[PDB]
Design a protein around this motif. Structure first.
Motif, PDB file in Angstrom:
ATOM      1  N   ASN F  62       0.819  -1.203   0.000  1.00 29.98           N
ATOM      2  CA  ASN F  62       0.000   0.000   0.000  1.00 29.98           C
ATOM      3  C   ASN F  62       0.857   1.259   0.000  1.00 29.98           C
ATOM      4  N   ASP F  66       1.456   3.800  -3.120  1.00 28.33           N
ATOM      5  CA  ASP F  66       1.183   5.236  -2.905  1.00 28.33           C
ATOM      6  C   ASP F  66       2.418   6.109  -3.180  1.00 28.33           C
ATOM      7  N   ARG F 146      11.806   0.591  -6.482  1.00 24.67           N
ATOM      8  CA  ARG F 146      12.442   0.230  -5.226  1.00 24.67           C
ATOM      9  C   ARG F 146      11.963   1.177  -4.138  1.00 24.67           C
ATOM     10  N   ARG F 149       9.798   2.907   2.116  1.00 22.93           N
ATOM     11  CA  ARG F 149       8.864   3.612   2.978  1.00 22.93           C
ATOM     12  C   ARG F 149       8.385   2.703   4.099  1.00 22.93           C
ATOM     13  N   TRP F 150       8.377   3.229   5.314  1.00 20.62           N
ATOM     14  CA  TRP F 150       7.835   2.487   6.435  1.00 20.62           C
ATOM     15  C   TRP F 150       6.404   2.060   6.117  1.00 20.62           C
ATOM     16  N   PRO F 151       6.017   0.810   6.417  1.00 20.26           N
ATOM     17  CA  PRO F 151       6.677  -0.237   7.200  1.00 20.26           C
ATOM     18  C   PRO F 151       7.581  -1.199   6.448  1.00 20.26           C
TER      19      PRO F 151
END
Ligand SMILES: CCCCCCCCCCCCCC(=O)OC[C@H](COP(=O)([O-])OCC[N+](C)(C)C)OC(=O)CCCCCCCCCCCCC
Ligand SMILES: CCCCCCCCCCCCCC(=O)OC[C@H](COP(=O)([O-])OCC[N+](C)(C)C)OC(=O)CCCCCCCCCCCCC
Ligand SMILES: CCCCCCCCCCCCCC(=O)OC[C@H](COP(=O)([O-])OCC[N+](C)(C)C)OC(=O)CCCCCCCCCCCCC
Ligand SMILES: CCCCCCCCCCCCCC(=O)OC[C@H](COP(=O)([O-])OCC[N+](C)(C)C)OC(=O)CCCCCCCCCCCCC
Ligand SMILES: CCCCCCCCCCCCCC(=O)OC[C@H](COP(=O)([O-])OCC[N+](C)(C)C)OC(=O)CCCCCCCCCCCCC
Ligand SMILES: CCCCCCCCCCCCCC(=O)OC[C@H](COP(=O)([O-])OCC[N+](C)(C)C)OC(=O)CCCCCCCCCCCCC
Ligand SMILES: CCCCCCCCCCCCCC(=O)OC[C@H](COP(=O)([O-])OCC[N+](C)(C)C)OC(=O)CCCCCCCCCCCCC
Ligand SMILES: CCCCCCCCCCCCCC(=O)OC[C@H](COP(=O)([O-])OCC[N+](C)(C)C)OC(=O)CCCCCCCCCCCCC
Ligand SMILES: CCCCCCCCCCCCCC(=O)OC[C@H](COP(=O)([O-])OCC[N+](C)(C)C)OC(=O)CCCCCCCCCCCCC
Ligand SMILES: CCCCCCCCCCCCCC(=O)OC[C@H](COP(=O)([O-])OCC[N+](C)(C)C)OC(=O)CCCCCCCCCCCCC
Ligand SMILES: CCCCCCCCCCCCCC(=O)OC[C@H](COP(=O)([O-])OCC[N+](C)(C)C)OC(=O)CCCCCCCCCCCCC
Ligand SMILES: CCCCCCCCCCCCCC(=O)OC[C@H](COP(=O)([O-])OCC[N+](C)(C)C)OC(=O)CCCCCCCCCCCCC
Ligand SMILES: CCCCCCCCCCCCCC(=O)OC[C@H](COP(=O)([O-])OCC[N+](C)(C)C)OC(=O)CCCCCCCCCCCCC
Lengths: 193, 193, 193, 193, 193, 193
Positions: F62, F66, F146, F149-151
């Protein structure tokens, strides 16, 4: 759905109706039909798909969804629209029949009795659907439904999709329905006085 | 589906028909076509997707759904609409043919026999679909279907999607069909007397 | 699909056609196009999605569905509609061309030969699609398809979605096609005598 | 998609065009646009969804589908329709411009050169799309695609959805395209002689 | 959804309105209705489908999605459109009523008070929806939602679909709403002076 | 989406515009709106559904989708169409306002300044969307993204759906946009000389 034909007939009805009746038909078109198509049908689209029950039992989610929602709210609202609109169609048909009779050879005589009966029927069907929905669902969908229908073993916990949005729209439509009742009452009194 | 063309033809038919016939066509448009598009088609949309059988056997759900529902109710209702509407189209075509004949050179003579035959055919097709549905499904869909069709091993338990809503609409359409029968009877008697 | 343009052209064709031709076009619109859109397209919607083969082999279901159904029935029926309608379009265009010719300066002379050729072509295309479907599928879809196409190992058992409903509609469309043939024969004889 | 606007413009174009041009536009509407909407778009709907590769590697199916089908056939056909129709729009606009010029103050002078250029451009765009499709896909989709694009490890076997139906429609559209070429050639010669 | 009927009524309203009112209705049609149908409805289509929570607990994703999004933004915008348009419908109906009154027997007298009230109501409903959205969602959707609603055990991390695109459109619609406010202010002042 | 209303307004605009402006509106309707509806919307339909990341981490796909696609290209193109069309609507409204003024009592005076400003605004909005897309996406979508981004733990490899087809259409729309710029330049010069 495609409400075009009903739209044609009801548009015809507007001309041969009181100002309050034209307001009522505007409410029907806008706050009932258009809301249902534009907003509510998407809310209820995933009603069974995203209905989830905590169990491994095959067939439990099906019977539990069916017991929680014997009829969907949106289908109920469709039927309500149809039945509250049918009297207006009856009156409009009687009016057109009298027009054809005149050609072979506004509201008074037989048409006045028919118009009063039309308002009456609309009011009774109105109230009837309101009360039936109260007795079937109340006016709030809770997120948890506890189901003990065979084949579910013992009582299982099942979870509703979008209960708060559904509650918002349940109440919106209840309010629109009550406004319709008020309009019909105004029609009766306005004809009386 | 798109019923626009049939709508055009049947709208034409209204003019060259009795008042009771115009009522009948209003019922057809509103309580049969519009209900099917707006309400019922969504009810039956997940009929096989959410049909579940308790088994690990590949192919059992397919053959069991097929045995339980050889034709879908909504497809049956489509066909019923078409076949009960075809006689009206025949009569309308004969009427237009006589109009063209006049131009080359209301209900009486040949048109009266054709109109009576139209009502008759509508009534027979009406009753026929009713009885066929009774013998195929009764008038209640139960939630459990027990299936022993190969490849299912022994008898398997399969579970229906939305059986109560489907039953509600089955009965709604049965009632609408019976109302249509009554209207056709009224047409026959009204012409007779 | 959207058959609106073909509808416009064929509606034009009705005026410049025999009464039996108007019946034929009514059949085309109602019992072929409308059935396909309203009923059959939903029947065939899950044709590959719910096609199931008993195997763990990747790619076996794809090649087996492809071998069982090289063309879908509904696509075949689309093409049949188009090709049986094309002659009528040819004749209508020739008619409009003669009308334009007159303006620059009913059925007789060149138009009569063209109309007979139109009926002939319609009949040959009609029969051709019927026979081709017989040789490709017979007239009954069985629930089991046994497939030995690479990569499927040995022979695998695959299972059809909704075979009985599909068979019902296969036969319905065959009957409608035969009725069309009969109508074209009637046109030929009616012109002859 | 909604081809309504292009339809309006091209319908206008029919009037200000040769009889063979009206045939060409009939072919465009019926055998290209309508086939694509009614039949082909459903064939290609599951093109990536049911594209399967034998591997456990994440991302291999995506890159392999992308390498096998850099553009979808149906999108190619959309673009072909647009580009073969654009010249006709140019000519129609020039015609309307001359009409407006006359009002401020059939095929001859500047309009004749423009019409010949219109046929020419249509023919060149026609041939160009044909040849490009040949060089991109040939004229047969095989069921197996062998893919060695990173991240797929070594060469993987991937399997196409509905390759035989897709081949049927590829060839159908090739034939329709060739018929269009023939019609344009006939236009050129018919104007010449 | 199908906004056709509201479109008809509002188009009527344009004629009997100020130039700034015609601008306002253009904004409503283009930057609110058309954006919602063409762009935003697709953005929000996978809002629950692709809402993901890190847990094994059945029912946690449902209750967490419901708590994060009690009403969807797009449904809020539908309702906003309806309620800001209703006053214009009231005024238009009063205008048509006066026209009918004249027939039985532009902006001045009673119509002027009604028009000012129409602008006022539009402004109050406008501001009300803006403020309500601020208090319900702020003006930025963050990617992480932390949810502690039963049955979720302790606090679970849930992840939003398309938060940045949704934020872009939230702000777009806020800006369009503010522009509408400015237009209504201009109407009031323009009538005043 | 349904572009019907914008279509009505812009069709009106054609009459009160230069020949090059009518060409520009033809390009807008055909090569931008129709391509987006008929071709591109299907290309981008599975953009998140078939976006795949190599990880077991919940929420990584997700946030990575995004970050890679903060706005979808097709939504960007919708907004571009709206904003490049708004000036034309302004000018058309001013024209209609002058017509109404005349009734109360072609391109010259105030309308000429407004038309030049309309072309200017169209050009600036045009260029602005082009440059913004360059800075957001360049003009090629690569198959690998690539994402850190957290998580997502460390950097994960994610894979795009249909990158080559998307690149083809990105470049198609860039070319159409450049053609629009050229047309606007031609309008300016043609008015100048
Ligand atoms: C079932 C009583 O069981 P329950 O209370 O445990 O179900 C609880 C409610 N749950 C079934 C929805 C979960 O029986 C019922 O409630 C029957 C309720 C009937 C509701 C309305 C029927 C008449 C509507 C008339 C509309 C037309 C008027 C013109
Ligand atoms: C012409 C007729 C007009 C009729 C208008 C009727 C509109 C009814 C709107 C709200 C109904 C109550 C919603 C509710 O009952 O919510 C309960 C929930 C707490 O329930 P619980 O789970 O904590 O126990 O509320 C919460 O705290 C969670 C936040 C819920 C906020 C929802 C705001 C909705 C705003 C809609 C505005 C519509 C404008 C037209
Ligand atoms: C199968 C008898 O086996 P079953 O009773 O075990 O199936 C039980 C019923 N289950 C197959 C649906 C599960 O055979 C049948 O029922 C055949 C029933 C035929 C129903 C109606 C056919 C005529 C419709 C005429 C409509 C047109 C008139 C104008
Ligand atoms: C112009 C022609 C008009 C025709 C109108 C026909 C309408 C027929 C409505 C209901 C048919 C019976 C439903 C039923 O047979 O339900 C059985 C189920 C118990 O069956 P079981 O599983 O316990 O054994 O009932 C339950 O207790 C569960 C609750 C079910 C309540 C359903 C209420 C439906 C209200 C619809 C109102 C429509 C108004 C137009
Ligand atoms: C394949 C023979 O192999 P099979 O019998 O084992 O396939 C068994 C049939 N299964 C492939 C469907 C499973 O080859 C064939 O059947 C070719 C059959 C050709 C059918 C019709 C082609 C002409 C249609 C003309 C329509 C236009 C006329 C105007
Ligand atoms: C204007 C032209 C009109 C053409 C009308 C053609 C209609 C053809 C209807 C039925 C075709 C035969 C279906 C069949 O061949 O079914 C086989 C299946 C036993 O096959 P098996 O698996 O046991 O071996 O039958 C069973 O027993 C299972 C029960 C099947 C009952 C299906 C009833 C369908 C009623 C449709 C009525 C349409 C009215 C217009
Ligand atoms: C790639 C050559 O690699 P490959 O042969 O291994 O790909 C094999 C083909 N596979 C990529 C589809 C699998 O490069 C190509 O084929 C490029 C082929 C270009 C095809 C047509 C481009 C011009 C179309 C003009 C249309 C407009 C005219 C008015
Ligand atoms: C106005 C322009 C008209 C253009 C009409 C073009 C129509 C082209 C139809 C067939 C193209 C060849 C299909 C094929 O190439 O199939 C290969 C496949 C064996 O390939 P393989 O895997 O064994 O190696 O054939 C098989 O045996 C499997 C059975 C395939 C039978 C398919 C019959 C299609 C009938 C369509 C009729 C359309 C009428 C308008
Ligand atoms: C719930 C307060 O709990 P929370 O802050 O933790 O929820 C945080 C917000 N979350 C529920 C969306 C996550 O209660 C609320 O926020 C209720 C907010 C009410 C918002 C607007 C209601 C009036 C709209 C009027 C529109 C019609 C005017 C004409
Ligand atoms: C008539 C009324 C006109 C109203 C127009 C309002 C348009 C608002 C456009 C952008 C709103 C801010 C988006 C944002 O707030 O993005 C935050 C995000 C960093 O947030 P974070 O997660 O790093 O913390 O930004 C990033 O860096 C990621 C890249 C985001 C770039 C998005 C560009 C959108 C361009 C839309 C152009 C529309 C033209 C009409
Ligand atoms: C009436 C029209 C009013 C237009 C007002 C536009 C206001 C633009 C403010 C942009 C602030 C960026 C701040 C910045 O830079 O902090 C981000 C870092 O630095 C960077 O990444 C460098 C980012 C460089 C962005 C350059 C944007 C140029 C926009 C020109 C618009 C011309 C319109 C006629
Ligand atoms: C984020 C810079 O981070 P990044 O380079 O690592 O993201 C790389 C790009 N990726 C976010 C798409 C992956 O910030 C940006 O790029 C902001 C870019 C802003 C693009 C256009 C904004 C103005 C559009 C005006 C349209 C209206 C004119 C009339
Ligand atoms: C009025 C305005 C007209 C504007 C027309 C613009 C059309 C742009 C078409 C192609 C853009 C370049 C595609 C590309 O950049 O492809 C890169 C890819 C190799 O990239 P790589 O992954 O190997 O590194 O190419 C390959 O080899 C794989 C094969 C790709 C062949 C694609 C052929 C598309 C033909 C479309 C024809 C449209 C006609 C109107």
């Amino acid at each position: 759905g495609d409400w075009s034909f009903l739209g044609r007939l009801l548009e015809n009805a507007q001309e041969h109706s009181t100002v309050i009746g034209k307001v009522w038909l505007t409410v029907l078109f806008i706050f009932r039909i258009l809301v249902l198509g534009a907003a509510a049908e998407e809310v209820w689209g995933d009603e069974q798909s995203d209905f989830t029950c905590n169990t491994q039992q095959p067939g439990c989610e099906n019977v539990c969804y069916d017991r929680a929602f014997p009829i969907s709210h949106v289908r109920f609202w469709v039927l309500q629209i149809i039945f509250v609109s049918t009297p207006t169609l009856i009156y409009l048909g009687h009016v057109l029949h009298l027009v054809r009779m005149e050609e072979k050879r506004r509201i008074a005589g037989a048409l006045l009795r028919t118009y009063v009966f039309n308002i009456i029927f609309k009011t009774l069907f109105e109230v009837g659907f309101i009360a039936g929905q109260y007795f079937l669902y109340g006016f709030q969908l809770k997120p948890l439904y506890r189901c003990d229908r065979w084949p579910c073993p013992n009582t299982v916990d099942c979870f509703i999709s979008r209960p708060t949005e559904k509650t918002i729209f349940i109440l919106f439509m209840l309010a629109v329905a009550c406004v319709s009742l008020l309009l019909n009452v105004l029609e009766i009194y306005h004809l009386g006085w």
